[PDB]
Write a protein that binds this ligand. Structure first.
Ligand SMILES: [K+]
Ligand SMILES: [Mg+2]
Ligand SMILES: [Mg+2]
Ligand SMILES: [Mg+2]
Ligand SMILES: [Mg+2]
Ligand SMILES: [Mg+2]
Ligand SMILES: [Mg+2]
Ligand SMILES: [Mg+2]
Ligand SMILES: [Mg+2]
Ligand SMILES: [Mg+2]
Ligand SMILES: [Mg+2]
Ligand SMILES: [Os+3]
Ligand SMILES: [Os+3]
Length: 74
RNA sequence: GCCAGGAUGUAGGCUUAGAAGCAGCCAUCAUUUAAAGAAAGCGUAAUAGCUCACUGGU
């Protein structure tokens, strides 16, 4: 009955990586490198607000947002 | 030609008083798809709104 909207993937990724802001040049200057176990946790929490058909698809999106801000997943 | 869609993470990150597809900078991934650009124009203070690409019907 009441919408609990979760934080933007970006702010979730910022928190996970432990930083205050993304790269001004995503491709050239990476400012953080997290592991998938985390990208996975984000895709699980952000799941209600996602239109994915599975977690791996959810992570695809989450990782896509990590690419736009300069964060690296391993 | 006309009708209908043109979506979701997301107001991408940065910067900026604001900067939400559309001041400027760096990128331009992914999801759900029949299709739909991190958007080709108009538009807003920033939003909104309208149109285009793209798809279906006729
Ligand atoms: K803008
Ligand atoms: Mg003609
Ligand atoms: Mg979008
Ligand atoms: Mg912003
Ligand atoms: Mg904001
Ligand atoms: Mg400055
Ligand atoms: Mg809008
Ligand atoms: Mg922008
Ligand atoms: Mg639009
Ligand atoms: Mg503008
Ligand atoms: Mg039309
Ligand atoms: Os319309
Ligand atoms: Os596509």
């Amino acid at each position: 009955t009441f919408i609990t909207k979760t934080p933007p993937a970006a702010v979730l990724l910022k928190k996970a990586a432990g930083i205050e802001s993304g790269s001004g040049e995503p491709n050239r200057n990476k400012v953080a490198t997290i592991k998938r176990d985390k990208v996975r946790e984000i895709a699980e929490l952000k799941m209600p607000d996602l239109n994915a058909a599975s977690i791996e698809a959810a992570m695809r999106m989450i990782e896509g947002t990590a690419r736009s801000m300069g964060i690296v997943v391993e």
